[PDB]
Amino acid sequence: NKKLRGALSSAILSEKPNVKWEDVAGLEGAKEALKEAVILPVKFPHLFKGNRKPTSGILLYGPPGTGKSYLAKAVATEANSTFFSVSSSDLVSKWMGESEKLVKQLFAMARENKPSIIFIDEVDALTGTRGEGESEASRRIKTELLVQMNGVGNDSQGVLVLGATNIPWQLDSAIRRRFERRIYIPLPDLAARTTMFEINVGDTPCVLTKEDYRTLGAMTEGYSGSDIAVVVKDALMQPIRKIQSATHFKDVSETRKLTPCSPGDDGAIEMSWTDIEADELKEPDLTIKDFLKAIKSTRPTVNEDDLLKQEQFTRDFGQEGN
Amino acid sequence: RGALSSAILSEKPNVKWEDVAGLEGAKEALKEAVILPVKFPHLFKGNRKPTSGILLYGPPGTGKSYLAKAVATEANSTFFSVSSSDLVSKWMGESEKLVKQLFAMARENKPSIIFIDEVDALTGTRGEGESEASRRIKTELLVQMNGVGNDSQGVLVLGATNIPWQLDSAIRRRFERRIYIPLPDLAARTTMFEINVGDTPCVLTKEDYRTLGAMTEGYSGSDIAVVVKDALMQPIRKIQSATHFKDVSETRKLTPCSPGDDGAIEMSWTDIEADELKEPDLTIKDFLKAIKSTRPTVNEDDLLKQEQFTRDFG
Amino acid sequence: SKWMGESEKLVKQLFAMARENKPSIIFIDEVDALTGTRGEGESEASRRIKTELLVQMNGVGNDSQGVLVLGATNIPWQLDSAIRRRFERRIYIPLPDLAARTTM
């Protein structure tokens, strides 16, 4: 009893990762389904009476790095529900059917604390089509997950079961059945990529315009949201590389302020960054050759046959996340 | 005792025999194995004994566990919905007494129907399994399901599965009527739409439900339950997506209407008072919308192995 | 490890050690032997050690602040694409050239 709750006390997360629905770029449809399955039952509970019941399972799939876990963080901030984040490390115990006794205890906790959300990240590692798997882990963890999700005496009222995966075709057909809205999270289009550059530069001083972000978004076809987060990471390192490779700085303008300049210029003293006083440094603003430099160096992460099997599954069983 | 008596349910899920659509052979066998021994117990004397094992099999999502809920409502029995979580244990010699206790309390509570759901997770051919869990459970269960003449009240052992070909041949022997629950045909689908819309106000006719039932070939009953779920959401999309409502008709009542219409004020649902909202009707474009978006679940080679097992043993 | 899902509470409490003693460096030498594209591998080792390494590197409730995960390999094309994603600067160490050889 209390030994097991002592184990699973470290799953009720308590920190609210501050991602909001606008920090997600793109994805109208997936935000729409997640709002009308998470936000709307709590905010207007009088509506869901009679035949009108809320959704009790949502699978997100896609290529690597496109927004799945991030959108789960957005739900974790905006939901106002207890957000269990469980994984395969926390269910496979050593001890003859704890990997069923733990699962049953998990949903028993998420019924005593309803409304709840259970986010099983990378569900394809629990649920592996059961034609080649081993007896215990296979039949008993998969089977207790099945029976526990709908079953006979079980009452999945007010719990929601999310889940993300990258290999949606290696999923057992009974568990493809339990997830009743398989939404597909794709690589971003033009407007989404432009939005992600505008978000990821943040409030950093840059000389860029709307046509500059528009240019970069036109330049990066094939990149997922991870890749654009790291080209913005690398391009934000470019002023430091300037400010170290600077034989020679120069005063400009609140009391003294010097920036790197070429050998022999208007007020060009010869020094190193080390020579210069705390704060009173002026670092060259993000100017578009920094981003072109980063985009030349950084190369895509997803290939183009993985996309064929993703589109296969979307055409055979799936929604379209827009 | 107080560890397996969490198999008895008591909430009685209110599904009655006129909610499963079709499946008349299966209702027939279940009635003459559950209802009829209790109602006329004088008949079963001599050579005429009741059935003591029934396996339901089929593709995923076609009615097996649901029909078990129908039995659980209509039976007037004591109903043990036991599973593999509730029988296996660390300590050796506990997965002997647990099965043994289960059947002994079933004979405390005669008549008893016991629903060992997904029997392929207890009974796994014993050539690769571990010592404790696989062998003593399956041998003790084989013994206690060899109670032919003594179990004339009490134990009727149901069981459902999706992988009926991965079942041990001794346990294929014990289940003496392997019935197959298939994907549903036209009249059943039309019945399921008529049931799942419930008492919700809709403009649909019999030829509309007939149209949708003609449209959905290949869907199981789960899929039609979720296209009715999504199509019942479609009004709240036509209330959230609103720039303009309008009064119609018990004191004020407004519904979404197009920009510029007879009494078309411009507002949002948020602007409008509790209750005094007029929830839009259910069209047929709502169902066509849902059927375009929702895509079937069973794959057409799973059906080949199901038909294989039915042709060899079923 | 040997006893059934000990081979991933090791992964988890490795990274929890590096979080208690930050700023930390984790050097996983020869990473292609842990992380093998998971289309042919076995259930426990494959899905559970690879999966706990994935979720533990970025995940949801995990906070990879101040830890750095190195890693070397000789077969970089046999690496799973989610783990190719997690390693965000794949640098290539080539055979030497003239000034380097003279220096050596």
Binding site: - | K90, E130 | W3, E44
Partner: peptide
């Protein structure tokens, strides 16, 4: 208690 090991 009878614990499970795991083989190759």
């Amino acid at each position: 208690d009878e614990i499970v090991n795991k083989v190759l």
